[PDB]
């Protein structure tokens, strides 16, 4: 079974997810999944074709478990890990505002998404975070956007130049 919308990888993960019946275990697995399979900094591209769909299924499980374990106030203001959402947002924004360059800034923003994307952090705080973190990242990235020659940019990004044609 190798379909686009339905396949063995997806079925397998649906089972792994059906076995998460505790918020701490499920939330930890979601965060681990994001470190392993999302963003250009993912530990591996083996799940490239299904990680988006699988992540959603894992999110569904974490949300359901969090709503059942948390009282109303914590559901609104605490991350699935028990952290105060506002504190995390403010601390991350502070780190972002102190970022020395665009390279540090991108690590902060991307890392924040991998660690706190919604089922983890309440949506309100998370999107407030997107608002502030994204602003600074762009401000640093778009300044003198074309000054660095491609030859040197490839080096800064740290890609392995496999082939060039012109």
């Amino acid at each position: 079974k190798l379909g686009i919308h339905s396949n063995d990888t997806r079925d397998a993960w649906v089972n792994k997810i059906a076995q998460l019946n505790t918020l701490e275990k499920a939330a930890e697995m979601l965060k681990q999944f994001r470190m392993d399979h999302t963003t250009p900094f993912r530990n591996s591209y083996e799940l490239d074709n299904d990680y988006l769909w699988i992540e959603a299924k894992l999110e569904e499980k974490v949300a359901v478990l969090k709503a059942r374990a948390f009282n109303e106030v914590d559901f609104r203001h605490k991350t699935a890990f028990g952290e105060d959402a506002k504190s995390v947002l403010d601390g991350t924004v502070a780190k972002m505002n102190a970022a020395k360059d665009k390279w540090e800034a991108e690590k902060i923003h991307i890392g924040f998404r991998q660690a706190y994307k919604p089922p983890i952090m309440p949506v309100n705080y998370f999107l407030d975070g997107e608002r502030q973190l994204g602003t600074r990242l762009m401000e640093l990235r778009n300044l003198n956007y074309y000054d660095t020659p491609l030859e040197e940019l490839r080096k800064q990004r740290g890609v392995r130049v496999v082939h060039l044609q012109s």
């Binding site: 919308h5 490239d48 973190l133 401000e139 490839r154 130049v161 496999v162």
Partner: protein, 511 residues
């Protein structure tokens, strides 16, 4: 005084600017490098009630024509086969642009702080909903009254099978809503609409009339009457941020990126639309493009915004140099991959080749002969067991997908751009076709992770992908897509399965 009195829109609008009030958290919820001025005004002094009336009047005329006279004239049928197919793509792809523009202007409405500027974007929000439903109606009408409903009736799901759809989403979906609100406004309004959409919409109605299609002119001409307000929104976006120090630092960069993004896809796809998607021609794309992008937009329109620090996109020259053969190079690929579409394609006929060669010297020696070869191989015949892809395999001409624009390119065969950059980053391979998109990726890796068709379909047999994504007619056997536009000898799923073509990721050959 007991005389008949009332109140009009302008009279209420006079006080709309004062509707917004100050409070600590009264600020946009979206990330942005720019600051839209608090006192920005809007050109059209509309209120909800009057907006609805002026659009209602337009709908009446439009739907009246469609349901009555045009239906009585069998206007849905009496259109050239090639154009009936072209409209499946033009109307549905445009539909997604209209739709995302809804979210796009909702985001700009959120960004604007002056009530009048918010109100201006609001009108566009409602207009793009109207346009979404209008484009939907065109496919709806052709499906119900045309010579071939397949594709017109399910494009929303059958468009997902092909690679041309990916590029459309970049410029007309994601490009409209993902990024700095201002960057989005440039892709949508200052570039998208002002440069391509406004002129394109009228051109389509002319090419449509030429091919016997009076349905599209009826709808698209109505859509066009709304665009003036959107041009004004794009213009006001620039005005609203012009006096902010950030503007001098970032405006031209976002504008240059937006320009390259839009043209990268439309330069080759539109020319493919007009020249290869019609029997009767109206004008050569080469000249049409230079007049639109260079003179009209890149000269006059952009020039008017020079007083706000707006400069001509630095990538304009590269765009022009790459433009000449772009659409010819791409149709070779679209036709070669015909089984992945939701429309029927036809090879240039004898008469057409003369035009191409006449308008593009050197066309025949390259594309002409190739097409002649494919037809000789039996590309139009189901019993041949041949699809142009095979020819690419046999001649070792790999087709790559630009990681950023999603535009397919075959550098070893193109007469236009032949550049190819292949990078490896953290376990993943990436292929680029130009220096502008490469920079975008190098600087913004996490913005461009779109899986291409080869990556997703890798190891899959062609007919399997087609069947899984419902690329079949109601008989459950005949393919929606076809390599010819005739009514007989239509390829079936079995005809493709027998070819046993399997997808492979071209980038894996690199070590």
């Amino acid at each position: 005084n007991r005389a008949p009195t009332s109140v009009n829109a302008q009279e209420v609008h006079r006080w709309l600017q004062s509707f917004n009030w100050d409070f600590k958290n009264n600020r946009t919820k979206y990330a942005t490098k720019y600051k839209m001025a608090n006192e920005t005004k809007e050109q059209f002094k509309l209120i909800a009630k009057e907006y609805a009336r002026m659009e209602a009047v337009k709908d009446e005329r439009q739907f009246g024509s469609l349901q009555d006279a045009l239906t009585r004239l069998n206007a849905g049928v009496r259109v050239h086969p090639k154009w009936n197919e072209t409209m499946k793509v033009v109307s549905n792809f445009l539909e997604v642009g209209e739709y995302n523009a809804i979210a796009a202007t909702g985001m700009l409405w959120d960004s604007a702080q002056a009530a009048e500027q918010k109100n201006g974007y609001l009108a566009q929000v409602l207009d793009e909903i109207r346009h979404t439903h209008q484009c939907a109606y065109v496919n709806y009408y052709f499906a119900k009254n045309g010579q071939d409903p397949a594709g017109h009736n399910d494009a929303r799901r059958t468009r997902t099978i092909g690679p041309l759809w990916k590029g459309m989403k970049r410029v007309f979906s994601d490009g409209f809503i993902s990024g700095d609100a201002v960057e989005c406004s440039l892709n949508l309004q200052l570039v998208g609409e002002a440069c391509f959409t406004n002129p394109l919409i009228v051109a389509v109605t002319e090419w449509a009339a030429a091919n016997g299609d009076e349905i599209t002119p009826t709808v698209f001409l109505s859509i066009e009457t709304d665009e003036l307000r959107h041009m004004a929104n794009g213009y006001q976006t620039v005005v609203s941020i012009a006096n902010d120090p950030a503007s001098a630092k970032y405006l031209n960069t976002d504008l240059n990126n937006a320009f390259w993004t839009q043209q990268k896809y439309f330069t080759p796809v539109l020319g493919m639309l007009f020249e290869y998607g019609s029997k009767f021609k109206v004008e050569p794309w080469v000249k049409t493009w230079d007049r639109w992008v260079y003179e009209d937009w890149g000269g006059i329109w952009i020039g008017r915004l020079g007083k706000y620090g707006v400069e001509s996109p630095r990538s304009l020259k590269d765009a022009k140099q790459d433009a000449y053969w772009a659409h010819h190079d791409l149709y070779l690929l679209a036709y070669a991959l015909w089984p992945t579409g939701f429309f029927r394609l036809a090879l240039p006929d004898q008469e057409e080749m003369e035009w191409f060669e006449a308008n593009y010297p050197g066309w025949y020696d390259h594309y002409g002969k190739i097409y002649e070869e494919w037809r000789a191989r039996g590309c139009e015949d189901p019993s041949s067991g041949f699809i142009p892809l095979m020819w690419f395999i046999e001649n070792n001409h790999p087709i790559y997908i630009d990681r950023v624009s999603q535009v397919p390119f075959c550098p070893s065969l193109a007469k236009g751009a032949s550049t190819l950059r292949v990078h490896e980053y953290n376990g993943e391979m990436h292929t680029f076709s130009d220096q502008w998109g490469e920079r975008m990726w190098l600087a913004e890796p996490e913005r461009y992770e779109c899986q291409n068709i080869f990556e997703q379909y890798e190891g899959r047999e062609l007919s399997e992908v087609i069947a899984e994504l419902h690329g079949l007619r109601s008989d459950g056997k005949t393919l929606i897509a076809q390599p010819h536009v005739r009514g007989d000898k239509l390829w079936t799923l079995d005809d493709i399965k027998r070819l046993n073509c399997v997808f492979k990721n071209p980038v894996k050959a690199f070590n």
